[PDB]
Design an enzyme around this catalytic site. Structure first.
Site, PDB file in Angstrom:
ATOM      1  N   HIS A   1      39.408 -39.429  39.665  1.00  0.00           N
ATOM      2  CA  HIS A   1      38.952 -40.775  40.013  1.00  0.00           C
ATOM      3  C   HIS A   1      38.516 -40.817  41.488  1.00  0.00           C
ATOM      4  CE1 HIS A   1      40.014 -45.335  39.320  1.00  0.00           C
ATOM      5  NE2 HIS A   1      38.759 -45.155  39.687  1.00  0.00           N
TER       6      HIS A   1
ATOM      7  N   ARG B   1      26.316 -39.182  42.006  1.00  0.00           N
ATOM      8  CA  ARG B   1      26.061 -40.031  43.162  1.00  0.00           C
ATOM      9  C   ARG B   1      26.380 -41.472  42.796  1.00  0.00           C
ATOM     10  NH1 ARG B   1      19.356 -40.413  42.645  1.00  0.00           N
ATOM     11  NH2 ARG B   1      19.397 -41.623  40.694  1.00  0.00           N
TER      12      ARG B   1
ATOM     13  N   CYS C   1      27.014 -40.746  34.956  1.00  0.00           N
ATOM     14  CA  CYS C   1      28.464 -40.846  35.071  1.00  0.00           C
ATOM     15  C   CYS C   1      29.118 -40.154  33.875  1.00  0.00           C
ATOM     16  CB  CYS C   1      28.898 -42.307  35.100  1.00  0.00           C
ATOM     17  SG  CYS C   1      28.055 -43.393  36.299  1.00  0.00           S
TER      18      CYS C   1
ATOM     19  N   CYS D   1      26.831 -45.547  31.772  1.00  0.00           N
ATOM     20  CA  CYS D   1      25.998 -44.855  32.752  1.00  0.00           C
ATOM     21  C   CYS D   1      25.848 -43.370  32.364  1.00  0.00           C
ATOM     22  CB  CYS D   1      26.621 -45.043  34.157  1.00  0.00           C
ATOM     23  SG  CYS D   1      26.246 -43.766  35.400  1.00  0.00           S
TER      24      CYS D   1
ATOM     25  N   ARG E   1      37.445 -47.099  49.212  1.00  0.00           N
ATOM     26  CA  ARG E   1      37.792 -46.386  47.981  1.00  0.00           C
ATOM     27  C   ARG E   1      38.738 -45.208  48.189  1.00  0.00           C
ATOM     28  NH1 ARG E   1      34.176 -47.360  43.946  1.00  0.00           N
ATOM     29  NH2 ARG E   1      33.134 -49.383  44.227  1.00  0.00           N
TER      30      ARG E   1
ATOM     31  N   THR F   1      25.766 -44.925  41.399  1.00  0.00           N
ATOM     32  CA  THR F   1      24.859 -45.386  40.349  1.00  0.00           C
ATOM     33  C   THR F   1      24.984 -46.893  40.151  1.00  0.00           C
ATOM     34  OG1 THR F   1      26.448 -45.208  38.540  1.00  0.00           O
ATOM     35  CG2 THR F   1      25.209 -43.214  39.130  1.00  0.00           C
TER      36      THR F   1
ATOM     37  N   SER G   1      44.047 -39.272  38.913  1.00  0.00           N
ATOM     38  CA  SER G   1      43.833 -39.899  40.216  1.00  0.00           C
ATOM     39  C   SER G   1      42.915 -39.067  41.122  1.00  0.00           C
ATOM     40  CB  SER G   1      45.179 -40.143  40.911  1.00  0.00           C
ATOM     41  OG  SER G   1      44.977 -40.747  42.175  1.00  0.00           O
TER      42      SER G   1
ATOM     43  N   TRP H   1      39.002 -46.669  33.033  1.00  0.00           N
ATOM     44  CA  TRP H   1      40.001 -46.092  33.932  1.00  0.00           C
ATOM     45  C   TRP H   1      41.401 -46.552  33.520  1.00  0.00           C
ATOM     46  CZ3 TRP H   1      38.820 -41.938  36.048  1.00  0.00           C
ATOM     47  CH2 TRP H   1      37.620 -41.726  36.756  1.00  0.00           C
TER      48      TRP H   1
HETATM   49  C1  LIG Z   1      34.398 -41.315  33.889  1.00  0.00           C
HETATM   50  C2  LIG Z   1      33.835 -42.297  34.912  1.00  0.00           C
HETATM   51  C3  LIG Z   1      32.787 -41.723  35.687  1.00  0.00           C
HETATM   52  C4  LIG Z   1      32.200 -42.527  36.681  1.00  0.00           C
HETATM   53  N1  LIG Z   1      31.198 -41.968  37.518  1.00  0.00           N
HETATM   54  C5  LIG Z   1      30.512 -42.677  38.551  1.00  0.00           C
HETATM   55  C6  LIG Z   1      29.521 -42.114  39.319  1.00  0.00           C
HETATM   56  O1  LIG Z   1      29.158 -40.898  39.219  1.00  0.00           O
HETATM   57  N2  LIG Z   1      28.887 -42.925  40.281  1.00  0.00           N
HETATM   58  C7  LIG Z   1      29.162 -44.253  40.554  1.00  0.00           C
HETATM   59  O2  LIG Z   1      28.621 -45.007  41.369  1.00  0.00           O
HETATM   60  N3  LIG Z   1      30.169 -44.750  39.757  1.00  0.00           N
HETATM   61  C8  LIG Z   1      30.839 -44.047  38.790  1.00  0.00           C
HETATM   62  N4  LIG Z   1      31.879 -44.498  38.027  1.00  0.00           N
HETATM   63  C9  LIG Z   1      32.426 -45.734  38.498  1.00  0.00           C
HETATM   64  C10 LIG Z   1      33.501 -45.813  39.544  1.00  0.00           C
HETATM   65  O3  LIG Z   1      34.535 -44.860  39.182  1.00  0.00           O
HETATM   66  C11 LIG Z   1      34.089 -47.173  39.765  1.00  0.00           C
HETATM   67  O4  LIG Z   1      34.786 -47.703  38.648  1.00  0.00           O
HETATM   68  C12 LIG Z   1      33.193 -48.184  40.459  1.00  0.00           C
HETATM   69  O5  LIG Z   1      32.482 -47.717  41.640  1.00  0.00           O
HETATM   70  C13 LIG Z   1      33.581 -49.590  40.596  1.00  0.00           C
HETATM   71  O6  LIG Z   1      34.722 -49.592  41.454  1.00  0.00           O
HETATM   72  P1  LIG Z   1      35.874 -50.637  41.441  1.00  0.00           P
HETATM   73  O7  LIG Z   1      36.280 -50.875  42.814  1.00  0.00           O
HETATM   74  O8  LIG Z   1      35.549 -51.742  40.498  1.00  0.00           O
HETATM   75  O9  LIG Z   1      37.088 -49.848  40.742  1.00  0.00           O
HETATM   76  P2  LIG Z   1      37.665 -48.371  40.911  1.00  0.00           P
HETATM   77  O10 LIG Z   1      37.503 -48.086  42.371  1.00  0.00           O
HETATM   78  O11 LIG Z   1      37.387 -47.504  39.744  1.00  0.00           O
HETATM   79  O12 LIG Z   1      39.115 -48.918  40.647  1.00  0.00           O
HETATM   80  C14 LIG Z   1      39.861 -48.978  39.421  1.00  0.00           C
HETATM   81  C15 LIG Z   1      41.228 -49.522  39.793  1.00  0.00           C
HETATM   82  O13 LIG Z   1      41.927 -48.254  39.936  1.00  0.00           O
HETATM   83  C16 LIG Z   1      42.411 -48.133  41.290  1.00  0.00           C
HETATM   84  N5  LIG Z   1      41.956 -46.868  41.784  1.00  0.00           N
HETATM   85  C17 LIG Z   1      40.759 -46.438  42.426  1.00  0.00           C
HETATM   86  N6  LIG Z   1      40.662 -45.187  42.753  1.00  0.00           N
HETATM   87  C18 LIG Z   1      41.901 -44.674  42.374  1.00  0.00           C
HETATM   88  C19 LIG Z   1      42.519 -43.403  42.423  1.00  0.00           C
HETATM   89  N7  LIG Z   1      41.863 -42.327  42.881  1.00  0.00           N
HETATM   90  N8  LIG Z   1      43.827 -43.249  42.005  1.00  0.00           N
HETATM   91  C20 LIG Z   1      44.609 -44.234  41.482  1.00  0.00           C
HETATM   92  N9  LIG Z   1      43.958 -45.479  41.382  1.00  0.00           N
HETATM   93  C21 LIG Z   1      42.624 -45.647  41.845  1.00  0.00           C
HETATM   94  C22 LIG Z   1      41.964 -49.369  42.082  1.00  0.00           C
HETATM   95  O14 LIG Z   1      42.970 -49.832  42.926  1.00  0.00           O
HETATM   96  C23 LIG Z   1      41.637 -50.342  41.035  1.00  0.00           C
HETATM   97  O15 LIG Z   1      42.802 -51.034  40.566  1.00  0.00           O
HETATM   98  C24 LIG Z   1      32.613 -43.939  36.870  1.00  0.00           C
HETATM   99  C25 LIG Z   1      33.601 -44.440  35.983  1.00  0.00           C
HETATM  100  C26 LIG Z   1      34.228 -43.663  35.009  1.00  0.00           C
HETATM  101  C27 LIG Z   1      35.228 -44.432  34.163  1.00  0.00           C
END
Ligand SMILES: Cc1cc2nc3c(=O)[nH]c(=O)nc-3n(C[C@H](O)[C@H](O)[C@H](O)COP(=O)(O)OP(=O)(O)OC[C@H]3O[C@@H](n4cnc5c(N)ncnc54)[C@H](O)[C@@H]3O)c2cc1C
Ligand SMILES: CCN1C(=O)CCC1=O
Length: 357
Positions: free
Chosen positions: A161, A117, A285, A282, A190, A119, A158, A130
């Site tokens: 993610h 969920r 996570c 986390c 997202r 977090t 992707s 990432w």
């Molecule tokens: C292994 C892992 C597990 C995680 N689990 C959780 C969790 O269970 N719950 C929670 O709240 N958060 C979790 N997170 C965090 C979450 O994935 C995000 O990083 C976060 O919510 C902050 O988002 P952001 O907008 O900073 O970047 P993100 O949205 O991660 O963006 C990273 C960058 O990658 C790009 N990007 C985003 N989505 C994609 C995609 N699908 N394909 C290609 N590029 C993409 C964006 O444009 C941006 O440049 C986790 C992170 C990791 C590394």
């Protein structure tokens, strides 16, 4: 087109899959609380200056990222060397040491009490992890299928993610009412406004579904006398039997095009991903990250190996999977099933959104 078919399949199995994953056999996952991160200390090293949070000073202390991503210790159980997760499926009907399950502080976590969920995890650390994953998309140049391998690796990451982004949007904490509910605006930010991320989740769904479909005929019994485990294996077959689709005729991960070298590299690449999960601050996570990276690595091992194998080899490949891996594979399928359902649910919220405008 392809979405339509995989979506129909998902509508049929969604509830039974969810039921199956709640069973005693599938609800637990072995996790080593001991973290070995190379990029930094994840054992006792805390994350300061909010380097691990998404953009909390005005919210109660019990809604801070560190709490939202914490485990529920009440459901966790001890993990000994006799834990069946370490056993080959062939053994179900030492072990932890043989299969390299060398965790200094391994425990069994209740996945029903620790769902994926929102977090609040994010910021610079999440971004670095990432980025490091997408950047490690490297394969020996000249190899037959190098570009196909790089494309498949990228799509899997992707979709992974995206599934996480979909889950944190679907199960979001409303800081006003204190209840977990869907957040359409976050979903759009997202996933919704980036069509290819939805496509990649469907790609991953097809890849995992295909791996499950491929091993089903060779899955060994879970037990001979135990009625509980017997019915569990039956319910698993009932779900998998409904996954059949002509989409499986497609060589999704280019198993027929990748050279043996690229396959090992591809496999080795995902091993590194599973490993960087130890750098995730986390707890929840990290747990789900470990589960899914392992699930994808397992789907790959299956698809690459079962491709040109005779019947004798197929029963061997499937029989040597560990319960740990099977749990990872099915729980990963469960997250993808939930992600597709979330997309459908959000599409309806979107519709009633523009209508209220
Ligand atoms: C292994 C892992 C597990 C995680 N689990 C959780 C969790 O269970 N719950 C929670 O709240 N958060 C979790 N997170 C965090 C979450 O994935 C995000 O990083 C976060 O919510 C902050 O988002 P952001 O907008 O900073 O970047 P993100 O949205 O991660 O963006 C990273 C960058 O990658 C790009 N990007 C985003 N989505 C994609 C995609 N699908 N394909 C290609 N590029 C993409 C964006 O444009 C941006 O440049 C986790 C992170 C990791 C590394
Ligand atoms: C050229 C550096 N590099 C690799 O070696 C794979 C991914 C990448 O950008």
């Amino acid at each position: 087109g392809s979405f339509n078919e995989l979506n129909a399949i998902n509508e049929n199995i969604r509830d039974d899959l969810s039921a199956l994953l709640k069973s005693d056999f599938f609800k637990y996952f072995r996790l080593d609380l001991y973290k070995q991160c190379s990029f930094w200390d994840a054992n006792d090293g805390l994350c300061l200056n909010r380097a691990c949070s998404v953009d909390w000073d005005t919210l109660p202390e019990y809604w801070q990222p560190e709490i939202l991503g914490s485990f529920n210790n009440d459901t966790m159980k001890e993990a000994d060397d006799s834990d069946d997760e370490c056993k080959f499926l062939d053994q179900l009907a030492n072990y932890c040491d043989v299969n390299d399950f060398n965790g200094k502080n391994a425990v069994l976590i209740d996945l029903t009490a620790n769902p994926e969920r929102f977090t609040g995890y994010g910021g610079k650390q999440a971004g670095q992890i990432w980025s490091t994953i997408y950047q490690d998309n490297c394969f020996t140049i000249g190899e037959t299928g190098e570009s196909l391998a790089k494309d498949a690796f990228y799509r899997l990451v992707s979709g992974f993610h995206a599934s996480i982004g979909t889950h944190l949007s679907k199960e979001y904490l409303n800081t006003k009412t204190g209840k977990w509910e869907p957040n359409l605006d976050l979903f759009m930010a997202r996933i919704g406004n980036f069509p290819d991320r939805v496509t990649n989740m469907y790609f991953n769904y097809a890849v995992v579904a295909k791996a499950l479909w491929k091993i089903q005929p060779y899955l060994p019994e879970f037990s001979f006398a135990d009625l509980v485990n017997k019915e569990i294996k039956n319910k698993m077959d009932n779900v998998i039997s409904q996954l059949d689709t002509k989409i499986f005729n497609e060589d999704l991960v280019f198993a027929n095009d990748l050279s043996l070298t690229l396959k090992d590299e591809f496999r080795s690449r995902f091993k590194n991903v599973t490993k960087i999960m130890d750098c995730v601050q986390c707890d929840r996570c990290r747990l789900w990250g470990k589960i899914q990276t392992t699930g994808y690595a397992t789907a790959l091992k299956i698809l690459f190996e079962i491709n040109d194998a005779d019947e004798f080899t197929k029963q061997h490949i499937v029989g040597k999977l560990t319960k740990y891996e099977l749990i990872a594979l099915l729980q990963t399928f469960g997250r993808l099933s939930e992600s597709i359902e979330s997309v459908n649910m959000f599409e309806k919220m979107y519709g009633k959104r523009l209508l209220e405008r």
